Amino acid sequence: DSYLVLIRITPDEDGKFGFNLKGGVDQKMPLVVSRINPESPADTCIPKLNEGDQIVLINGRDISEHTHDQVVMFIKASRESHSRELALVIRRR
Amino acid sequence: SKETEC
Ligand code: NA
Ligand code: NA
């Protein structure tokens, strides 16, 4: 029914990946993609990021016990990265 | 109910 996807994204010139996030352990709501900015890096990588995708790992980090704000920081940290690339393992149904 | 642009 549900399956895991590894998504790999490089930020645009502004530093953004082109998606919005909701949830976190503070939000009593799993952590999920709420928006894909059309034609952004998140929309244009293969495989691509989808609205409603549940975030499982961020750069191999299990984020199930981290706050919303923490996860946003984890996302930003991957621009200062080695490959400057973001690697998300997501779950889709 | 937080929503953040990434
Ligand atoms: Na795809
Ligand atoms: Na990952």
Author numbering:
A (entry chain A): 5 to 97
B (entry chain B): 1 to 6
What does the paper say about this structure?
PTPN3 is a multidomain protein of 913 amino acids comprising a N-terminal FERM domain that determines subcellular localization, a central PDZ domain involved in protein-protein interactions, a short linker of 30-residues and a C-terminal protein tyrosine phosphatase (PTP) domain able to dephosphorylate protein substrates. The human protein tyrosine phosphatase non-receptor type 3 (PTPN3) is a phosphatase containing a PDZ (PSD-95/Dlg/ZO-1) domain that has been found to play both tumor-suppressive and tumor-promoting roles in various cancers, despite limited knowledge of its cellular partners and signaling functions. We solved the crystal structures of the complexes formed by PTPN3-PDZ with peptides comprising the PBMs of HPV 18 E6 (PBM-18E6) and of the cellular partner TACE (PBM-TACE). In all cases, the overall PDZ fold of PTPN3-PDZ is highly conserved, and the peptides bind in the conventional mode as an anti-parallel extension to the β2-strand.
PTPN3 also regulates the activity and expression of the Tumor necrosis factor alpha-convertase (TACE) protein, which impacts the release of soluble tumor necrosis factor α (TNF-α). In that case, PTPN3 was reported to bind TACE through a PDZ-PBM interaction. We determined the dissociation constant (KD) of PTPN3-PDZ for the PBM-TACE peptide comprising the last C-terminal 12-residues of TACE and encompassing the PBM (sequence RQNRVDSKETEC) following the 1H, 15N chemical shift perturbations of PTPN3-PDZ NMR signals in the 1H-15N HSQC spectra as a function of peptide concentration. The PBM-TACE peptide binds to PTPN3-PDZ with a KD value of 30 μM. An interesting feature of PBM-TACE and PBM-HBc is the presence of the C-terminal cysteine at P0. We observed that in the complexes of PTPN3-PDZ with PBM-TACE and PBM-HBc, the cysteine side chain is oriented towards the interior of the peptide-binding groove, without making any contacts with the hydrophobic side chains that line this pocket. The cysteine side chain is short enough to fit within the binding pocket and occupies the same position as the conventional leucine side chain at P0 of HPV16 E6. At P-1, the Q side chain of PBM-16E6 and PBM-HBc and the E side chain of PBM-TACE form a H-bond with a water molecule that is in turn bonded to the Nδ2 of N524 in the β2-strand of PTPN3-PDZ. Lastly, the side chain of K526 from the β2-strand is pointed towards PBM-HBc and PBM-TACE, allowing its Nζ to form H-bonds with the carbonyl oxygen of the K or R at P-4 and with the side chain hydroxyl of S at P-5, contributing to the stability of the complex. Forming a H-bond with the short, polar side chain of S could favor the K526 side chain to orient towards the peptide, while in the other cases it adopts an extended conformation to maximize the hydrophobic contacts with the Cβ-Cγ carbon chain of E at P-3.
